[PDB]
Design a protein around this nucleic acid. Structure first.
Ligand SMILES: [K+]
Ligand SMILES: [K+]
Ligand SMILES: [K+]
Ligand SMILES: [K+]
Ligand SMILES: [K+]
Ligand SMILES: [K+]
Ligand SMILES: [K+]
Ligand SMILES: [K+]
Ligand SMILES: [K+]
Ligand SMILES: [K+]
Ligand SMILES: [K+]
Ligand SMILES: [K+]
Ligand SMILES: [K+]
Ligand SMILES: [K+]
Ligand SMILES: [K+]
Ligand SMILES: [K+]
Ligand SMILES: [K+]
Ligand SMILES: [K+]
Ligand SMILES: [K+]
Ligand SMILES: [K+]
Ligand SMILES: [K+]
Ligand SMILES: [K+]
Ligand SMILES: [K+]
Ligand SMILES: [K+]
Ligand SMILES: [K+]
Ligand SMILES: [K+]
Ligand SMILES: [Mg+2]
Ligand SMILES: [Mg+2]
Ligand SMILES: [Mg+2]
Ligand SMILES: [Mg+2]
Ligand SMILES: [Mg+2]
Ligand SMILES: [Mg+2]
Ligand SMILES: [Mg+2]
Ligand SMILES: [Mg+2]
Ligand SMILES: [Mg+2]
Ligand SMILES: [Mg+2]
Ligand SMILES: [Mg+2]
Ligand SMILES: [Mg+2]
Ligand SMILES: [Mg+2]
Ligand SMILES: [Mg+2]
Ligand SMILES: [Mg+2]
Ligand SMILES: [Mg+2]
Ligand SMILES: [Mg+2]
Ligand SMILES: [Mg+2]
Ligand SMILES: [Mg+2]
Ligand SMILES: [Mg+2]
Ligand SMILES: [Mg+2]
Ligand SMILES: [Mg+2]
Ligand SMILES: [Mg+2]
Ligand SMILES: [Mg+2]
Ligand SMILES: [Mg+2]
Ligand SMILES: [Mg+2]
Ligand SMILES: [Mg+2]
Ligand SMILES: [Mg+2]
Ligand SMILES: [Mg+2]
Ligand SMILES: [Mg+2]
Ligand SMILES: [Mg+2]
Ligand SMILES: [Mg+2]
Ligand SMILES: [Mg+2]
Ligand SMILES: [Mg+2]
Ligand SMILES: [Mg+2]
Ligand SMILES: [Mg+2]
Ligand SMILES: [Mg+2]
Ligand SMILES: [Mg+2]
Ligand SMILES: [Mg+2]
Ligand SMILES: [Mg+2]
Ligand SMILES: [Mg+2]
Ligand SMILES: [Mg+2]
Ligand SMILES: [Mg+2]
Ligand SMILES: [Mg+2]
Ligand SMILES: [Mg+2]
Ligand SMILES: [Mg+2]
Ligand SMILES: [Mg+2]
Ligand SMILES: [Mg+2]
Ligand SMILES: [Mg+2]
Ligand SMILES: [Mg+2]
Ligand SMILES: [Mg+2]
Ligand SMILES: [Mg+2]
Ligand SMILES: [Mg+2]
Ligand SMILES: [Mg+2]
Ligand SMILES: [Mg+2]
Ligand code: NA
Ligand code: NA
Ligand code: NA
Ligand code: NA
Ligand code: NA
Ligand code: NA
Lengths: 111, 48, 122, 50, 78, 52, 102
RNA sequence: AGUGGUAAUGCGAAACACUUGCCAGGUAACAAAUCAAUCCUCCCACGGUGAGCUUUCUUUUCACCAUAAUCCACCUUGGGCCUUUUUACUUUCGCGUUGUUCGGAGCGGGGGCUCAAGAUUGAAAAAUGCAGCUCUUACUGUCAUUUGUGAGUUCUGCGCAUUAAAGCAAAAACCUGGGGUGU
RNA sequence: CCCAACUGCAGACCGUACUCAUCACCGCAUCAGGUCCCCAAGCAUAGAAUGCUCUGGUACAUAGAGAAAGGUACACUCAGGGAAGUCGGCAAAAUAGAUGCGUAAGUUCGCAAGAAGCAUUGGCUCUGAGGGCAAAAAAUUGCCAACUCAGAACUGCUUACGGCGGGGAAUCCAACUGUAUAAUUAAAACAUAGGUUUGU
RNA sequence: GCAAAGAUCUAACGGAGAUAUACUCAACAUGCAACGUUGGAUACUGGAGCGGGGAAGGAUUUCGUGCCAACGGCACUCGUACACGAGUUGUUCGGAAACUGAGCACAACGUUAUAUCGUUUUGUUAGGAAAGUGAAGGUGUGUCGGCGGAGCUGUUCGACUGUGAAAAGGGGCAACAGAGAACCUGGGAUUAUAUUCCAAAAAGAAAUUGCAUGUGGGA
RNA sequence: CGGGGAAACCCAGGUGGAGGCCUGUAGCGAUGCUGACGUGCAAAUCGCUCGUAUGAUUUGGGUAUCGGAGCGAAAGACUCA
């Protein structure tokens, strides 16, 4: 006979925030323990793809607040915000677009 | 309630649990520190 | 499971054999014999019962040299090279006590790992 | 069920205290006219609905 | 709960002011010294009985020592 | 409720240090990463806002 | 405290022995559709995973190269081999022919 | 007044410290079906303890055989990425799914980085729980015991995620960075 | 003053009994009506169908005696005939699971279709087929789990639990799925996609 | 008439509810019929349950003892009846403090003989002066580093004030199933409450806030 | 994945799992018996049979629109018998 369980906290609805697991206790009882909600993790900007960043953990609220700064970023520029391919694109684009402005401005000054 | 137990009965309450009764009164469960015997203070109160 | 079974194969069921054998079960019948309930003829019947009622390889009676019985010092010893459950010799004991009609007078209990013992109801 | 305002719980508590019979010694007063509580309430007869 | 790795670390724990008691658990294999500090219970596991007996005698008498046994229902009622 | 695509276009604030993020009805052919020019001196390309 | 009343599985366990040997599963005992008792997608998934598992092992053992594997990988998906033995016999035919061209 | 690695990115006992002066991103934050499926459930096996049946059968039938949060170290699966070879793709390329794919805008192969689910080890913790049993009265002591290529199971993989003239709330609060302070 | 590893002290406020229904709520009531959410065992079986069962629960619904007529039924049977009954096949009967074969007109080519129809089905004892892992033409050598299908021989049937379409030929209407007169009308009515017109 | 939801039987005990008799008479033919509890027997519900939880609604019906006048459409010794006495324990559970939503409508303004009317989220009140908060800098205090000869000058961080960059768009409510939320096992801990009770071996193991003291590192 | 074909293209096995698709639980309804009842269990219920059951689907709480007015896939339906 499969034992039947009851809700143990005052909320009794099967929502995404009220998910429980069945737990066998040292007293050989089957109880319900609430599943902690999860975060999706640190992502890149939605306009840039919305992809999970490398070297960053997925922590929720209290966990992200008490964790060290390295669980949520890298040592590279824009660490924990942009990815390695997005940072390299900006470094190249910052230098190359600036160079074109210098060449065009010098050409104007020479004429 | 913890301060009033100090002034009235010269005891320390390490825990107070309170409920409001179904007749409207509030009842307090006052646990004393191990330094104080609750039976000795009950005798001094007069409820023995 | 791997090979489909046959109904004719029930005439011989392969039993597991211990790699390092000599497992011994002891049934202590001292208390019934001390009081006189288990007399010498009953002691012989008890030893004889286990000889021709213990099913080895699905067969009852042909114990071969794999199962040895030796009733010494009022206890029964069962030394085997096969994987025998200890519960089998408590189940075989009750069949003897039921046939002799003392299942309501003598109870079989467990004392140690590998030993059973015959007592009286409290 | 479990939820009620404290104000609602305190109205229900007073109604519980009023749900008592008349004391026996009230009937022995000089000009007494009360024999039973005419304002007795049962949860299955009449609803307070607080 | 926290686990103590070395003997030097164990002695530092027992010297703390928040070291109410040491509970000595005699498992058949190893001996555990569970030091009841304020926030954490620190346990040093010693597999060697000869070494474990030396540590129990070397515990300072200032800190309370308790031999962990199986207390009965009747020993704790009322 | 609308059948035409909408475009979020990122501009800088002309007076402050902040971005603006307009939202307008996209013309056909607008793509992400396109540069949108709005003003008197804007060129005549698809997606640009010019005086009539 | 009395024990629970008996609910024995002895009759079910002897029925299981008979059913494992093939009894009580005939055409007159079937109440559900053929692909409700064993779905056809479960039979296909089992076969295709078996065929792909063998092809990966033959490639890892250098019995076939990447060009024989890729040809047989798509033929397996195209329902060319009925079982593991059918695929192996085709592999042997390929190997024997490749020996003659050598 | 941070630092190591070619790189993916690593390192926390306290200067790798302050940032709601300011700015920008992210979490919160939402999504089908198929297929794998977690905790648990049910079945098998294996073995102990007790009980049931035993004219006759049944190495038998029934019950039980539990391990809560919180931390420590940390090889299995799946994804993203890095470096190296790319002389990787046609009169005939390769890798992979049950399934509609993918690749010089970098497939496969070697070696690694990281993330997510889990093993596994330990502290907790057996000192607990359960059942039996012994002495002999006391809600008394002592002592014994503590595998599944099976079937379910939406937690999870899992989304720029469903039919779509359907495209699937927001905010507080928190996280990281850019600039700057430290200088 | 700012940081970590601790430590000391403090952690206020309200709810918390019981119920959640064939007796706790609404219906005048302890009313066969109504009322949201969670946990959900074994066997048969495709199964949250249906039937029976271990755990949990229950024996509470005024009862006893007891073959009158006439009734009601989540009850049956009926020789010969077979819709002759009746406004009308109302009601009942009937078909029926699974597998193989086979299937018409018409058609918007999707259907019609389970069209219509034939056949097999049990129990036993076997035989094939469908796999995983490990070991240096390994195209062999051992070991092993969970089921399924097919084919035989023998041997039965009183055709024998439950659950489970009757079918065909036409005419009228509405294309279709939907809605809709709570408490006499579910329809051909209403909606619908499609078509047209108007104002701006 | 008190006929849907199958169904009860037996012994013992309890109870005033029995085995209750002018004469005659051995017992049947003269005390019937019905209760509650326990043990057996039999059955039903059959996990979409006459099972164990909660919301709305109810509000003491919960628990123990006593009780049988009226009530439970028959019965009662039983009872959700009556009487008396009890029972609801939280840093972490739910709510609030403390989020926004469909929405509401205080202020403001307008209107109305009449405010008891209208606007009041498409970033957002009001012809509309609704910011009382504050980067740097200047002035003193405390905690420091540094140079030169425990004191002084400049310098980093906190407190204090006379100058004041920048922050457009009043104040609220509305979710006990959305967001958010630091505790979970054992108990011999009850007659009734328990992730709420347990006290030194807390049965115990934790996690979190807010302040302080000391040690260590910077200032 | 095969087979035909000069080409255009055609034809066969499997895979996949679409549909205001079908059968059928729970749910949501209410066709017939013109059955039961009709001083009822019930001021609309009961039984069997029946419609639908992935969707224009069913449902909790909250919120918005009412009296010559509200709301209505339209029955003068519904707006606390
Ligand atoms: K509650
Ligand atoms: K609860
Ligand atoms: K009222
Ligand atoms: K998902
Ligand atoms: K899914
Ligand atoms: K009812
Ligand atoms: K069967
Ligand atoms: K009745
Ligand atoms: K009759
Ligand atoms: K009759
Ligand atoms: K009959
Ligand atoms: K005929
Ligand atoms: K006629
Ligand atoms: K047919
Ligand atoms: K139109
Ligand atoms: K009657
Ligand atoms: K009495
Ligand atoms: K079930
Ligand atoms: K709780
Ligand atoms: K107003
Ligand atoms: K509510
Ligand atoms: K406590
Ligand atoms: K309804
Ligand atoms: K809704
Ligand atoms: K009104
Ligand atoms: K109006
Ligand atoms: Mg994710
Ligand atoms: Mg409280
Ligand atoms: Mg409730
Ligand atoms: Mg209320
Ligand atoms: Mg298919
Ligand atoms: Mg090829
Ligand atoms: Mg998302
Ligand atoms: Mg654990
Ligand atoms: Mg409570
Ligand atoms: Mg409760
Ligand atoms: Mg109940
Ligand atoms: Mg309920
Ligand atoms: Mg009833
Ligand atoms: Mg009522
Ligand atoms: Mg079967
Ligand atoms: Mg069923
Ligand atoms: Mg009854
Ligand atoms: Mg006839
Ligand atoms: Mg009919
Ligand atoms: Mg045709
Ligand atoms: Mg015509
Ligand atoms: Mg129609
Ligand atoms: Mg339909
Ligand atoms: Mg209707
Ligand atoms: Mg009608
Ligand atoms: Mg019409
Ligand atoms: Mg037309
Ligand atoms: Mg009568
Ligand atoms: Mg009647
Ligand atoms: Mg009845
Ligand atoms: Mg008596
Ligand atoms: Mg008599
Ligand atoms: Mg039964
Ligand atoms: Mg059912
Ligand atoms: Mg039930
Ligand atoms: Mg139920
Ligand atoms: Mg009661
Ligand atoms: Mg009565
Ligand atoms: Mg009362
Ligand atoms: Mg709003
Ligand atoms: Mg507006
Ligand atoms: Mg305005
Ligand atoms: Mg609020
Ligand atoms: Mg949401
Ligand atoms: Mg919530
Ligand atoms: Mg809370
Ligand atoms: Mg209770
Ligand atoms: Mg349909
Ligand atoms: Mg009708
Ligand atoms: Mg009628
Ligand atoms: Mg009548
Ligand atoms: Mg139909
Ligand atoms: Mg249907
Ligand atoms: Mg239905
Ligand atoms: Mg009309
Ligand atoms: Na409650
Ligand atoms: Na039962
Ligand atoms: Na007729
Ligand atoms: Na009884
Ligand atoms: Na009272
Ligand atoms: Na389908």
């Amino acid at each position: 006979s499969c034992p039947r369980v009851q809700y143990r906290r005052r909320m009794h609805y099967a929502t995404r925030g009220n998910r429980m697991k069945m737990v066998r206790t040292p007293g050989n009882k089957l109880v319900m323990q609430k599943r902690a909600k999860r975060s999706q993790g640190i992502h890149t900007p939605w306009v840039l793809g919305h992809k999970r960043l490398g070297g960053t953990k997925a922590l929720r609220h209290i966990d992200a607040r008490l964790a060290s700064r390295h669980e949520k970023s890298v040592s590279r520029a824009y660490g924990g915000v942009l990815s390695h391919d997005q940072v390299r694109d900006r470094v190249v684009r910052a230098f190359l677009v600036e160079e074109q402005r210098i060449v065009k401005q010098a050409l104007k000054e020479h004429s | 309630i913890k301060k009033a137990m100090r002034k009235l009965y010269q005891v320390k309450a390490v825990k107070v649990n309170t409920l409001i009764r179904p007749d409207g009164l509030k009842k307090a469960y006052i646990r004393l520190s191990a330094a104080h015997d609750a039976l000795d203070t009950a005798n001094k109160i007069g409820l023995v | 499971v791997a090979v489909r079974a046959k109904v004719g194969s029930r005439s011989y069921v392969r039993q597991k054999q211990l790699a390092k054998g000599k497992k011994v079960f002891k049934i202590d019948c001292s208390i019934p014999a001390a009081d006189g309930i288990f007399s010498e003829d009953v002691l012989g019947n008890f030893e004889q019962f286990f000889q021709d009622n213990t099913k080895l390889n699905g067969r009852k009676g042909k114990l071969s040299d794999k199962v040895r019985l030796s009733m010494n010092d009022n206890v029964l010893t069962i030394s085997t090279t096969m994987a025998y459950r200890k519960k089998y010799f408590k189940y075989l004991t009750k069949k003897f006590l039921k046939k002799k009609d003392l299942r309501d007078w003598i109870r079989i209990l467990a004392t140690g790992k590998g030993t059973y013992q015959l007592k009286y109801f409290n | 069920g479990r939820f009620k305002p404290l104000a609602v719980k305190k109205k229900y508590a007073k109604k519980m205290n009023q749900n008592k019979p008349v004391p026996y010694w009230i009937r022995l007063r000089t000009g007494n006219r009360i024999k039973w509580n005419e304002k007795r309430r049962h949860w299955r007869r009449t609803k307070l609905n607080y | 709960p926290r686990e103590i790795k070395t003997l030097k670390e164990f002695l530092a724990i027992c010297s703390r002011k928040d070291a109410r008691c040491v509970k000595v658990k005699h498992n058949p294999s190893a001996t555990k010294f569970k030091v009841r500090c304020s926030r954490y219970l620190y346990t040093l596991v010693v597999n060697d009985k000869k070494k474990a007996d030396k540590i129990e005698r070397s515990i300072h008498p200032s800190v309370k020592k308790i031999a962990v046994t199986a207390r009965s229902h009747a020993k704790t009622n009322a | 409720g609308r059948g035409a695509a909408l475009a979020r276009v990122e501009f800088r604030h002309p007076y402050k240090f902040r971005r603006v993020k307009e939202l307008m009805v996209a013309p056909e052919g607008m793509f992400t990463g396109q540069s949108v020019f709005c003003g008197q001196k804007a060129p005549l390309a698809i997606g640009n806002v010019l005086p009539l | 405290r009395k024990p629970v009343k008996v609910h024995s599985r002895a009759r079910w366990r002897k029925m299981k022995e008979a059913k494992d040997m093939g009894r009580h599963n005939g055409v007159g005992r079937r109440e559900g559709s053929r692909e409700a008792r064993m779905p056809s997608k479960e039979l296909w998934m089992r076969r295709l995973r078996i065929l792909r598992r063998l092809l990966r092992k033959y490639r890892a053992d250098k019995k076939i190269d990447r060009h024989v594997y890729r040809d047989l990988y798509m033929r397996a998906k195209g329902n060319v081999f009925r079982n593991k033995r059918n695929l192996v016999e085709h592999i042997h035919k390929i190997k024997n022919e490749k020996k003659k061209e050598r």
